[PDB]
Symmetry: C2
Subunit: 131 residues, 2 copies
């Protein structure tokens, strides 16, 4: 399927020696359009907090951001468009499109530049598609 190929041959691609640990494309309601093998199960409250942070940035920063019950420290993101979090050497990037969330989870520091920025680039592409 189109959405599975976006995960397996765009988001999960090894780039400059590094690959996401996991990735998925979800609806604004947290429905899984497509996902990687080790992608975590979000809780509805977690998706609601992410969505509230996109509507009003700074919502998640004081308490942190939870993913399958794992705490992530909110770090700088693009307001209303991207939410970034850090846990240990890894982190999470969430890009919001008109109809979807693109999610990438990393276990290791990525290379500098846009080469590894697969979550943001796929989200930009779907937005230009009107999705």
């Amino acid at each position: 399927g189109s959405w599975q190929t976006y995960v397996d041959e765009h988001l999960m691609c090894e780039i400059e020696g590094h690959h996401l640990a996991s990735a998925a494309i979800l609806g604004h309601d947290g429905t899984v359009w497509a996902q990687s093998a080790d992608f975590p199960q979000f809780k509805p409250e977690e998706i609601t907090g992410i969505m509230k942070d996109f509507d009003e940035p700074g919502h998640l920063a004081p308490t942190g951001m939870f993913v399958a019950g794992a705490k992530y420290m909110v770090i700088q993101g693009e307001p209303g468009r991207v939410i970034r979090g850090k846990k240990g050497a890894g982190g999470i990037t969430i890009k919001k499109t008109g109809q979807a969330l693109v999610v990438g989870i990393y276990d290791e520091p990525m290379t500098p530049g846009q080469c590894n920025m697969v979550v943001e680039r796929l989200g930009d592409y779907l937005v230009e598609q009107g999705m």
Copy 2:
């Protein structure tokens, strides 16, 4: 610049252990919007033959396709959208957008799948942008 970053941090990215030898984004008139360091100089006749092949597919197949005077054997492509050529272990991929040509040149066989298909993915993105 936006067009240079597309070349340096999208097209020239190392992906699954392989990187393009060279890449560029050109107008339909062969003007260089942005290019890699070792990108070749196309001749106007070469750009005209590529453009004629997009307007009428099969134009270049009998005589081959010339890039800086180097012969490439035309191989299967998407008619009106993509032109692919082979020279030795390497090859060339040309994707046509509404206003531009995306060009990638490889010295080595790429990995199977869309992960390495940077020329086609950038061209799709610009087309969705209306470019």
